[PDB]
């Protein structure tokens, strides 16, 4: 009966005043408005011609427009009504607008985006529901707020600031609290000294004042003020402004660590107008007490809470039909909740035809009120039982309802692979299994648990028996791979306000909670209602990476994990971003909180944006299972960044594509092949292979016009392409060619991870005031078995130098004894580093075909390690002593983070690779650790 | 928050009045009493004085 | 005003109690007992071992027959043993795996147990069909059931982790009386031969004498520097000993309302898990968390002997009603009878 005056699509414009049947939901109002338009309207012929889908219901909230996308939403969920009541807008107004068709601008933009991604986002040919499209319509508002909350100038410049304390082994290099800025301009090299703790604004003001009467020498217009300029590295684009001590910029620290000069050049601010984002027209899109049958008459019933249903869950497996079979066979269905198997069911052997039928029922033990939000209905065709097929299906859906009706699903064939919740896109040669979920005259709408005062924690406040505490806190202080026996789960589930002030226990507390029931989950959602000893805890991000793993699928465990991660800083985010990407696979739905986190992160930084883009693209090109989800994420991202970033992505994609074409052509099969390489490369130069594409592993290092005489094809197995571009930046302080190797046939999902893990290890050692100088050479994966590898010049394979050798060679390369000793050191430090790191990562054992002595580093990541004679000889034992000491010291430094090493190792071996985890416990194993580690070294020696 | 603290503090003093309003006995007499009790029941305690193995059901016999 | 005057009245009545106790402290038990002959060395031998429990044993209790005894274990079962024959009169599997206590009824018909479930489940051995059926679920406690002792076939007292005790009527399944006053989790209790009084031990390092009839705290004893883990009445019923995590035992007399004796040694550093008196009371058998169970002279305070028959913590121990034998449970999943 609610009176709402509707703005009619057609006319002075005509408005219809109604009495909306607000008791029901939007469908009733739609029918009422339709009939009223049919009858009252003088132009009723217009709407009579038009069907129901030719008009949309949009309402003006605070000025903008919002869509009533779901008619299933109840009147209360219509925030317009409450908004009006607060504003007392009676009758309210909902604009009945007429639909329209897309324009060509939008279509071209969409084709561009789909070309970037490598996979259509508007594909609806492999989805059995509208989860994807609603994810897409929902990600808009977070992106609009993220973009509106950006600083134009600073983002354009994207200063790469930092806030970690300066390590000691660099504080020796720094003296007098000052550094030497080699200012450039045009060709003048004006050197001015400034204190190591000055903001760039101060430096610029000081330089302006000092040379306020000589700047014409520097070749700068006198008419310009200080703000008319901003510094910039030479040979890159990393701008240096903002508010930060000039000691806090990663490039300054790199220079200091490697002991090289600091060179800057004046520049101008990339104008904010170049960062415009094209406008978007897409308008922006209960509990158990209100949604229960009890206390109502059947004629006023529209919904039935999932908990009233005391019955048992049962499913109808009609049968299977495959176009062709690619023995005994039989099905097995399961319910699952994060690698858990709540209940199991199966059937009996059957003939192995191309199609089989039962129409049988399978009944589950778990009541329809005991189901958790996120259950997985696994369906496993075994054969004889050697698994041959699988597929999964959520039981509740994204919009808080239960699945009901006939479903036909296409099976995958045979990790994070088996938890996928999407249907095979092969609709014409995949095995299809149909099923029916019994229907319901009303929909089954699971509410969300209400947190209420839970006083078991409130008024159990004294301390517990020092016996029970002593047997509990010995269990809690175990490995994060600790098997929790039901004893342990019990002892902890009763002590559910003792381990609520011990963060180091959380992934052992919620590993016990039983998700098979309904009271357990209510209690556990009241447990998380008072978390004042978690939010304000210590932000240990080696822990939060266990609340976002396979074993956990809840909707608030991951929420608190992401709340912890929200407070990280940009560089910290960058260090682990590979796993955060790898940790959106397990998000049970498509839309989640980790995904919105990555979205919001990519729209206020640019290095994060770039690396996010490349990782999402690699997975979309590879992870067929989740490719739709990643594509949704990536496209929701690409509508927010600026036009210039879009163009840079486009150009990088073009270059990689052309190089892939040339590579695939080349590996089709002597010097004629080399000449054909030359011809193809020259033609590509002719075919608009551009000369300005920010090299993907380095958003600053631009590679210019190719240097053709330098390329070649190596004689190794894969025989990659040895490209040698030239820098496109004229101000470069040198002229070394930006090298790359381009290689086809070796999986680049391992070497991309391992490198992240060793980068983290380097960060840890740095935090522990050491420096073992490992070299992470930027590697990125572009497709399947295809990758672009950065080139480390000044290098030579160990094998080669052998085909006292290594020592002589070194003495030669360094005529001066001082440089020789600085080398021998940059060799000891690094050989130690690598030896320890590989003894930890369990890969040390392999022939010496992947090692490049620039310093020392390893390549081509396929006994503790290799410590061949030549290395030690390069290092009687004096340097050999400094070697052992640095080895053992680093070993224990790292054993103080075995929690983080184990979590990263496991989350890696579960999502990257194609009894195997235990080696990290034995390997990681103070005197005891030292003795064990020294034993390894002595054995290799 | 006075009505709770006061209602609690009253229970304390009403308890301490209970405990203090008791007629205790001299420690010397308490000891004498316990010593003469053990002295009285010392014979009837096989753990204190080992009794014959025959009277022990655990050692002498397996049938019970 | 009202609260500061009531706090100073509390803290004056407290020193009035301290002076009322110091007045009676005329002579020590070590002086009076200097004369009596030392008890010597109680050389004990392991007579029986009770195999069958699959995990830690948490509690045990002799029957009034001096032959049967219950024992609770982490394995989720409640077994009734025949000490003489080692045969299990019953092997009851439990609904809750975290059972912590058990108590053979004096009548022999019922046995009770409990733990983390916050319920004192009463079991019937002499059931209509002869099976092991649960007579009652004594619910109402807000914490784990820490200990309980049968008064009769229809009455049973239980302690819990809610910092209170309670008397139950098995028939109504209702807390007849509630013993409030403790400020800590109540680890143990012990009924006097006269069923009208019982003591209880708590983590506040103090014990309290309760009136079963009324339900009031009669006296409060202190002296332990740590949680009291075990407590029981002296055979006569005028004194009681307490075991604590402070690695020391103490004897308390009700009439003297103060500590009489301390039983401890510099070597002993771990807490006491259990205690029991001999039928006469001259011997105090204390269980320890170092695989040992030292025998003290109650009057001399000398360590007469040690019972070392377990590879793990000796969590619990008991004495037969006839004082004929000593049982000692342990975390090694084995009980042991001693003589
Ligand atoms: N990141 C890199 N930078 C420069 N050169 C490299 C890099 N990685 C590998 N190489 C060169 O490639 C050669 C090894 O090729 P590789 O692909 O490892 O052969 P295979 O695939 O048979 O192991 C070495 O000679 C090495 O110098």
Coordinates of C-alpha atoms in Angstrom, one line a residue, chain C residues 42-198:
Chain C
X42 CA 58.1 -47.4 53.8
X43 CA 59.6 -49.8 51.2
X44 CA 56.7 -50.3 48.8
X45 CA 56.4 -52.8 45.9
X46 CA 54.2 -52.6 42.8
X47 CA 51.7 -55.4 43.3
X48 CA 49.4 -54.8 40.3
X49 CA 49.4 -52.9 37.0
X50 CA 46.2 -52.0 35.3
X51 CA 46.6 -52.2 31.6
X52 CA 43.8 -51.3 29.1
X53 CA 43.5 -47.6 29.1
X54 CA 44.6 -46.2 25.7
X55 CA 45.7 -42.8 26.9
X56 CA 46.3 -40.7 30.0
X57 CA 44.5 -41.7 33.2
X58 CA 43.0 -38.6 34.8
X59 CA 41.2 -39.9 37.9
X60 CA 40.4 -43.0 39.9
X61 CA 38.4 -43.9 43.1
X62 CA 38.3 -47.0 45.3
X63 CA 35.0 -48.6 46.2
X64 CA 33.8 -49.1 49.7
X65 CA 34.4 -52.8 49.2
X66 CA 38.2 -52.0 49.0
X67 CA 38.3 -54.1 45.8
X68 CA 36.6 -52.2 42.9
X69 CA 37.8 -48.9 41.6
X70 CA 36.9 -46.6 38.7
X71 CA 39.4 -44.8 36.6
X72 CA 38.9 -42.1 34.0
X73 CA 41.2 -41.7 31.0
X74 CA 41.7 -39.5 28.0
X75 CA 40.6 -42.3 25.8
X76 CA 36.9 -41.5 26.4
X77 CA 36.2 -44.6 28.4
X78 CA 35.2 -45.1 32.1
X79 CA 36.5 -48.5 33.2
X80 CA 35.6 -50.3 36.5
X81 CA 38.5 -52.5 37.7
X82 CA 38.7 -55.4 40.1
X83 CA 41.9 -54.6 42.0
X84 CA 42.1 -58.2 43.2
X85 CA 41.7 -59.8 39.8
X86 CA 42.6 -57.0 37.4
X87 CA 39.4 -57.8 35.4
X88 CA 37.3 -54.9 34.2
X89 CA 33.9 -55.1 35.8
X90 CA 32.8 -52.5 33.2
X91 CA 34.4 -50.7 30.3
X92 CA 31.9 -47.8 29.7
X93 CA 32.6 -45.7 26.6
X94 CA 31.7 -42.0 27.3
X95 CA 30.0 -39.3 25.3
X96 CA 32.7 -36.7 26.2
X97 CA 36.3 -37.6 25.6
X98 CA 37.6 -35.0 28.1
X99 CA 36.6 -36.8 31.3
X100 CA 38.5 -35.5 34.3
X101 CA 37.1 -37.2 37.4
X102 CA 35.3 -40.3 38.6
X103 CA 33.8 -41.4 41.9
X104 CA 32.7 -44.9 42.9
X105 CA 29.5 -44.7 44.9
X106 CA 29.7 -46.0 48.5
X107 CA 26.7 -48.2 47.8
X108 CA 28.4 -49.7 44.8
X109 CA 25.4 -49.4 42.5
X110 CA 26.2 -46.1 40.8
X111 CA 29.4 -44.6 39.4
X112 CA 29.8 -41.0 38.3
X113 CA 32.2 -39.1 36.1
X114 CA 32.6 -35.8 34.3
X115 CA 34.9 -33.3 32.8
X116 CA 34.9 -30.7 30.0
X117 CA 31.2 -31.4 29.3
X118 CA 30.2 -29.2 32.3
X119 CA 27.9 -32.1 33.3
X120 CA 28.2 -34.7 36.0
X121 CA 26.9 -37.8 34.1
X122 CA 25.7 -40.5 36.6
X123 CA 25.9 -44.1 35.4
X124 CA 24.1 -47.1 36.7
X125 CA 25.9 -50.4 36.9
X126 CA 22.9 -52.3 38.3
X127 CA 20.5 -51.4 35.5
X128 CA 17.1 -53.1 34.8
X129 CA 18.7 -54.8 31.8
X130 CA 22.1 -55.1 33.4
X131 CA 23.6 -52.6 30.9
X132 CA 25.6 -49.4 31.7
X133 CA 22.9 -46.8 31.3
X134 CA 23.1 -43.1 32.2
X135 CA 20.8 -42.3 35.1
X136 CA 21.2 -38.5 35.1
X137 CA 23.0 -35.6 33.4
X138 CA 23.6 -33.2 36.2
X139 CA 23.8 -30.0 34.2
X140 CA 23.9 -26.4 35.5
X141 CA 27.6 -25.9 36.1
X142 CA 29.1 -23.2 33.8
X143 CA 32.5 -24.9 33.8
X144 CA 34.2 -28.2 33.4
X145 CA 33.4 -30.8 36.1
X146 CA 36.6 -31.0 38.2
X147 CA 35.6 -33.6 40.9
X148 CA 32.6 -35.2 42.6
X149 CA 31.9 -37.7 45.4
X150 CA 28.8 -39.7 46.1
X151 CA 27.0 -39.1 49.3
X152 CA 24.6 -41.9 48.7
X153 CA 22.6 -43.5 45.8
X154 CA 20.6 -40.3 45.5
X155 CA 23.0 -37.6 46.5
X156 CA 26.4 -36.5 45.1
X157 CA 28.6 -33.4 45.5
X158 CA 30.4 -32.0 42.5
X159 CA 33.0 -29.3 42.0
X160 CA 33.6 -27.4 38.7
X161 CA 35.6 -24.7 37.0
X162 CA 32.9 -22.1 37.7
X163 CA 34.6 -21.4 41.1
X164 CA 31.8 -22.9 43.1
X165 CA 30.8 -26.3 44.4
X166 CA 27.3 -27.8 44.5
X167 CA 25.3 -30.6 46.2
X168 CA 23.0 -32.5 43.9
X169 CA 20.0 -34.7 44.3
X170 CA 20.3 -37.4 41.7
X171 CA 16.6 -37.9 41.5
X172 CA 15.7 -34.2 40.7
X173 CA 19.1 -33.7 39.0
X174 CA 19.1 -30.3 40.7
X175 CA 21.8 -28.5 42.8
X176 CA 20.4 -28.9 46.3
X177 CA 23.0 -26.4 47.7
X178 CA 25.5 -24.1 46.0
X179 CA 28.8 -23.4 47.8
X180 CA 29.8 -19.8 46.8
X181 CA 32.8 -18.0 48.1
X182 CA 35.7 -19.4 46.2
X183 CA 37.7 -17.0 44.0
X184 CA 39.3 -19.6 41.9
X185 CA 38.7 -22.8 39.9
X186 CA 38.0 -25.6 42.4
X187 CA 40.4 -28.5 41.7
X188 CA 39.4 -31.0 44.3
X189 CA 37.2 -31.8 47.3
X190 CA 36.9 -34.5 50.0
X191 CA 33.9 -35.7 52.1
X192 CA 34.5 -36.2 55.8
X193 CA 33.5 -39.5 57.3
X194 CA 30.6 -37.4 58.7
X195 CA 28.8 -36.4 55.5
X196 CA 27.8 -33.0 56.9
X197 CA 31.2 -31.4 56.2
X198 CA 33.5 -31.4 53.1

